[PDB]
Amino acid sequence: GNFGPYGGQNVPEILMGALEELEAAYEGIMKDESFWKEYNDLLRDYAGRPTPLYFARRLSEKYGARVYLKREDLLHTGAHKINNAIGQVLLAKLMGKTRITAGTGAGQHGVATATAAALFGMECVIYMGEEDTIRQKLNVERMKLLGAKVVPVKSGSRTLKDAIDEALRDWITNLQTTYYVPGSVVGPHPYPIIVRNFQKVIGEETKKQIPEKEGRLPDYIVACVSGGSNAAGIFYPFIDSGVKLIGVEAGGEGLETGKHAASLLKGKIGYLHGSKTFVLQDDWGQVQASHSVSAGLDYPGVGPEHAYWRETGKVLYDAVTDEEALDAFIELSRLEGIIPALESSHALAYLKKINIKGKVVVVNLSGRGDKDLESVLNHPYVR
Amino acid sequence: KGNFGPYGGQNVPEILMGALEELEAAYEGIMKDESFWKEYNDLLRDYAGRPTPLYFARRLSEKYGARVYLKREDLLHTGAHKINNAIGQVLLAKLMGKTRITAGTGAGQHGVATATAAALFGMECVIYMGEEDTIRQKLNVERMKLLGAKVVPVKSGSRTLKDAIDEALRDWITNLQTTYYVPGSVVGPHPYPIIVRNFQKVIGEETKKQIPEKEGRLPDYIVACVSGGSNAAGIFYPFIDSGVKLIGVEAGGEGLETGKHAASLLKGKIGYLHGSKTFVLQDDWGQVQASHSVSAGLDYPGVGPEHAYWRETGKVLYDAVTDEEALDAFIELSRLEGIIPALESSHALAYLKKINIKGKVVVVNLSGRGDKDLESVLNHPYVR
Numbered sequence: 001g002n003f004g005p006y007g008g009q010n011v012p013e014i015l016m017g018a019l020e021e022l023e024a025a026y027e028g029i030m031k032d033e034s035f036w037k038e039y040n041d042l043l044r045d046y047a048g049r050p051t052p053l054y055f056a057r058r059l060s061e062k063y064g065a066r067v068y069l070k071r072e073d074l075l076h077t078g079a080h081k082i083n084n085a086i087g088q089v090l091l092a093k094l095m096g097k098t099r100i101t102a103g104t105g106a107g108q109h110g111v112a113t114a115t116a117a118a119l120f121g122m123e124c125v126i127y128m129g130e131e132d133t134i135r136q137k138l139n140v141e142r143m144k145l146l147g148a149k150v151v152p153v154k155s156g157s158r159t160l161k162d163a164i165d166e167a168l169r170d171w172i173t174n175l176q177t178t179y180y181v182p183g184s185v186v187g188p189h190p191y192p193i194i195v196r197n198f199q200k201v202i203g204e205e206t207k208k209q210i211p212e213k214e215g216r217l218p219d220y221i222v223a224c225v226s227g228g229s230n231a232a233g234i235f236y237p238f239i240d241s242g243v244k245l246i247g248v249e250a251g252g253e254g255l256e257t258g259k260h261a262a263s264l265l266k267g268k269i270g271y272l273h274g275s276k277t278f279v280l281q282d283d284w285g286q287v288q289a290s291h292s293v294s295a296g297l298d299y300p301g302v303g304p305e306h307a308y309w310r311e312t313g314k315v316l317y318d319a320v321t322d323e324e325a326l327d328a329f330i331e332l333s334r335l336e337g338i339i340p341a342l343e344s345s346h347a348l349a350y351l352k353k354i355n356i357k358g359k360v361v362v363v364n365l366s367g368r369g370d371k372d373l374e375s376v377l378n379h380p381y382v383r
Numbered sequence: 384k385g386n387f388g389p390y391g392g393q394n395v396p397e398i399l400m401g402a403l404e405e406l407e408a409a410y411e412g413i414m415k416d417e418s419f420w421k422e423y424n425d426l427l428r429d430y431a432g433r434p435t436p437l438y439f440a441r442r443l444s445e446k447y448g449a450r451v452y453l454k455r456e457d458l459l460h461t462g463a464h465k466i467n468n469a470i471g472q473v474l475l476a477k478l479m480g481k482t483r484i485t486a487g488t489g490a491g492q493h494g495v496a497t498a499t500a501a502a503l504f505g506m507e508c509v510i511y512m513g514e515e516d517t518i519r520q521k522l523n524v525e526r527m528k529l530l531g532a533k534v535v536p537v538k539s540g541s542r543t544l545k546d547a548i549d550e551a552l553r554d555w556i557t558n559l560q561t562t563y564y565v566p567g568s569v570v571g572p573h574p575y576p577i578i579v580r581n582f583q584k585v586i587g588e589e590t591k592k593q594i595p596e597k598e599g600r601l602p603d604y605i606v607a608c609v610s611g612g613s614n615a616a617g618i619f620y621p622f623i624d625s626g627v628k629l630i631g632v633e634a635g636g637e638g639l640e641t642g643k644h645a646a647s648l649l650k651g652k653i654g655y656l657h658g659s660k661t662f663v664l665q666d667d668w669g670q671v672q673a674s675h676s677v678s679a680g681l682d683y684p685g686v687g688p689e690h691a692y693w694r695e696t697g698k699v700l701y702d703a704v705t706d707e708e709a710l711d712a713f714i715e716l717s718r719l720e721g722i723i724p725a726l727e728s729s730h731a732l733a734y735l736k737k738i739n740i741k742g743k744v745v746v747v748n749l750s751g752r753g754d755k756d757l758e759s760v761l762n763h764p765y766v767r
């Protein structure tokens with residue numbers, strides 16, 4: 001589970017037995033026709049796959065380009081997270097586990113996990129930073145109705161990083177019964193591989209859909225990147241194809257302000273939540289608090305596969321600010337009638353940063369922005 | 384003809400007759416135009432997300448000893464079947480040269496769907512909403528603002544859907560040259576009930592193609608909630624006279640014998656409402672009465688004339704469930720399947736407990752998702 005020098009299994013020793021068990025089970029289902037039948041049936045009828053690739057005519061006219069939106073916002077629960085949550089909770093049920101735990105920032109992973117746990121009849125305990133239980137309270141309501149226990153985390157920054165800390169402590173305390181579901185491609189092997197392999201359906205669909213619209217591969221594919229699961233899913237089938245793959249990190253108040261979540265652009269090599277990867281840290285190796293207007297991107301690390309792609313030049317990375325993402329959120333609502341997630345709005349904001357006159361561009365619309373409605377309107381820049 | 388047996392017609396002030404004949408003429412022109420349906424079908428597929436899946440609800444099927452399938456209209460863009468009609472009508476408005484859209488809304492799903500379509504086509508949009516539904520469906524009020532629409536709250540009358548539609552029709556009458564009125568249901572003067580039903584019948588045409596690949600035959604039952612009746616008409620129409628038992632479920636409110644409900648077909652009388660001769664909740668003196676329902680989307684005192692005709696000729700069966708039965712089905716689908724249904728659709732799901740379906744194949748129209756209803760459902764005394 002190494003992507004060049006990145007990745008690995010950097011965990012307390014007690015977890016190695018659990019990770020070896022998970023790796024053996026996963027390798028078992030990768031050749032199991034019955035797993036992929038039930039999983040693909042649920043993706044189609046329960047989640048709503050395949051998602052359409054939508055020609056955004058008014059957006060295209062504004063930029064003089066051909067802009068297509070991969071509509072992951074149309075999935076059940078409203079975000080790409082459901083592709084991963086269904087697959088992993090199914091794997092957990094097949095392994096004999098009876099309990100699910102996870103951390104969540106925007107609440108989209110928590111809702112998707114609680115949804116899969118209700119579908120498969122499993123106990124579910126979701127950890128979420130206290131600050132995020134307010135900015136994304138609508139998702140807290142959904143989780144409780146779906147039968148999950150929501151535990152607010154008041155430690156540290158009280159956001160995603162600290163929720164994951166608590167979920168990992170829960171997992172270690174409950175290894176007998178509990179399967180830990182990471183929401184992104186960050187974690188000890190085999191988790192980054194498992195999550196990416198559940199999300200690459202996005203890129204595989206996109207790869208079959210775009211020739212039907214333009215007769216060729218796109219010029220650009222743009223996706224937002226915090227941990228990196230939605231971007232890994234759409235990028236993976238296109239690696240080394242010649243398409244320009246652009247991952248967009250959260251620039252927060254600005255890359256020079258110290259208030260951002262741009263791990264690849266501003267972090268250093270380090271260890272976080274099981275992975276050797278790029279992490280925002282001070283000069284003494286202490287992990288720093290991240291910041292973003294988007295709770296989903298508010299995380300100080302990045303997936304090890306993206307650190308490897310950045311190093312080898314297979315994917316290009318940049319960042320946009322809070323204000324640029326807010327402008328793109330408003331722009332898509334007005335021009336196309338689609339309210340995007342504030343996470344995905346970072347990708348849409350990057351349309352202003354590339355020379356795309358006459359170019360074919362696919363933007364990964366990773367989720368819908370109903371959860372962000374209150375925080376956008378109350379933001380001082382929008383007011 | 385615009386008449387479903389004795390129901391329907393164009394019972395409107397004279398000032399609207401000209402606009403309705405122009406609308407009927409324009410609609411007949413596009414009914415044979417392949418350039419219209421190519422653009423409309425492409426938008427349904429890539430923008431709204433059609434076709435929607437037919438989902439086998441395994442845990443729900445186990446509870447009732449049946450084979451229960453959900454038609455997942457909740458997975459459409461904006462989260463409800465209303466988008467099918469709103470896209471088609473705003474497209475018609477574009478081809479007619481209109482520049483402004485107006486409508487009324489109850490649950491906010493039609494207001495959001497209409498504002499969404501107006502944004503897509505770059506049109507001015509003005510939505511009217513009852514003041515009560517402004518506070519009970521506040522999530523949809525915010526969506527409409529960011530989509531670029533103006534939302535006018537209505538404090539008149541019962542401050543719900545009926546009064547909002549009144550104001551929207553008043554808006555249309557005073558803006559007849561630039562404004563296209565988008566009804567949210569199969570209620571209104573001809574040709575609107577036909578137009579709305581012909582946009583919604585894609586639900587049933589898809590269902591008719593999907594159910595044989597799951598069961599090799601037609602279902603025993605198809606169940607859908609009914610207020611105005613557009614989602615039920617959409618799924619029922621391709622199945623009329625097919626031998627399938629078609630069941631429309633009206634809002635029973637606090638009980639059919641309490642006077643606090645919205646069951647127009649079961650407890651209304653023949654009357655005129657918003658252009659249609661149909662069944663309307665009224666007193667013995669012919670005065671329309673206020674409806675009531677825990678669901679804002681079903682809180683309407685009339686019903687579409689095609690459903691009045693279907694009930695009279697026996698082609699569809701109609702019944703009701705109470706507010707409490709709807710809330711139970713809302714919680715049940717959330718816990719058992721991980722699907723949070725609209726409170727409107729929950730009336731159809733609650734009816735699974737009211738018929739003998741042991742060993743039967745049942746399709747339920749899941750007309751929307753219920754994220755808009757979470758605050759209302761939790762704070763309800765029966766749930767608390």
Ligand SMILES: C=C(/N=C/c1c(COP(=O)(O)O)cnc(C)c1O)C(=O)O
Nearest residue numbers: 104105108109184226228229230296367
């Ligand atoms: C942190 C969360 N959200 C992640 C997220 C992200 C960022 O996660 P990835 O970088 O793993 O795609 C992007 N888009 C949407 C709609 C998201 O919900 C969470 O839901 O817990």
Ligand SMILES: C=C(/N=C/c1c(COP(=O)(O)O)cnc(C)c1O)C(=O)O
Nearest residue numbers: 488489492493568610612613614680751
């Ligand atoms: C009254 C509205 N909609 C009602 C509605 C209904 C009732 O409308 P029809 O009887 O026309 O299907 C059913 N299902 C959902 C999800 C709904 O939102 C409105 O949004 O204004």
Ligand SMILES: Oc1ccnc2ccccc12
Nearest residue numbers: 103109182183184186227
């Ligand atoms: O484990 C996780 C759950 C939700 N979101 C996450 C984002 C980045 C890294 C890990 C995550």
Ligand SMILES: Oc1ccnc2ccccc12
Nearest residue numbers: 487493566567568570611
């Ligand atoms: O005209 C309408 C707009 C929205 N909803 C409606 C529900 C029932 C009957 C008419 C309606």
Ligand SMILES: [K+]
Nearest residue numbers: 261263299301
């Ligand atoms: K990050």
Ligand SMILES: [K+]
Nearest residue numbers: 645647683685
């Ligand atoms: K009614």
